[PDB]
């Protein structure tokens, strides 16, 4: 799916 | 009835996250982005989880909503805009968070 983004 | 303050309710606190080498947390949601799996009617930005228990360990908690960042508002904005802003920031990153209240 993908959604979380590590900044 | 009125605005809350010295009691259990929606508070407004700030946090200082210094990048070294990075922030240490991921963001989700956004208006038109990948989407957030926390709120159905709210498409804001949320800190899904944390990896390194150091920078944003005692500052930010998992499932918190980001209202403002370094002066830039994060409401009604697109995800790509939020991520781009957080990445460009210098070392010390000051953010504002809030804890909802609904019984």
Question: Any idea where the domains of chain B sit in the sequence?
Answer: 1-103
How many CB atoms are located within 10 Å of the residue A7 CB? 19
Strand partners of residue B27: A5
Neighbour-count burial for B40-56, b at 16+ CB within 10 Å, e otherwise: eeebbbbbbebeeeebb
User: B57 CB near a chain A CB, below 8 Å?
Assistant: no
- Tell the residue number behind the tokens 């309710």, with chain if given: B9
Residue in this structure with the two tokens 């993908």, named with its chain if needed: A2
- State the DSSP H helix or E strand holding residue B85, giving kind and residue range, or none if neither: helix B79-88
User: Is the Cα dihedral B37, B51, B19, B59 positive or negative?
Assistant: positive
List chain B residues with CB under 8 Å of A5.
26-28, 34, 79, 83
How far A6 CA sits from the closest chain B CA (Å)? Answer: 4
- Taking the C-alpha atoms of B17, B48, B27 and B35 in order, what is their torsion angle to the nearest 10 degrees? -160
Most distant CA pair in chain A, distance: 18
Q: Kindly state the DSSP code that residue B50 receives in the 8-state scheme.
A: B
Alpha-carbon gap, residue B46 to B99, rounded angstroms: 11
**Which structure tokens are listed for B73?**
């508002």
**Technique used to solve these coordinates:** NMR
Is the CATH number of domain B1-103 2.30.42.10? yes
Instruction: From residue B88, give the alpha-carbon distance in Å to each of A2, B25, B54, B70.
Output: 22, 15, 21, 11
Contact assessment for residue B43 and residue B31, using Cβ atoms and an 8 Å cutoff: yes
Selection from B82, B65, B69 nearest residue B17 by Cα: B69
**Which residue among B25, B35, B36 places its CB closest to the CB of A7?**
B25
């Amino acid at each position: 799916t993908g959604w979380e983004t590590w900044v | 009835g009125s605005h809350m303050g010295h009691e259990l309710a929606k508070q407004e606190i700030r946090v200082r996250v210094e990048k070294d080498p990075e922030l240490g947390f991921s963001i989700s949601g956004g208006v038109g982005g990948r989407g957030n799996p926390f709120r159905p009617d709210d498409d804001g930005i949320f800190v899904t989880r944390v990896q390194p228990e150091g920078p944003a360990s005692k500052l930010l908690q998992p499932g918190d909503k980001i209202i403002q960042a370094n002066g830039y508002s994060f409401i009604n904005i697109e995800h790509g805009q939020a991520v781009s802003l957080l990445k460009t920031f210098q070392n010390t990153v000051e953010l504002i968070i809030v804890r909802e209240v609904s019984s």
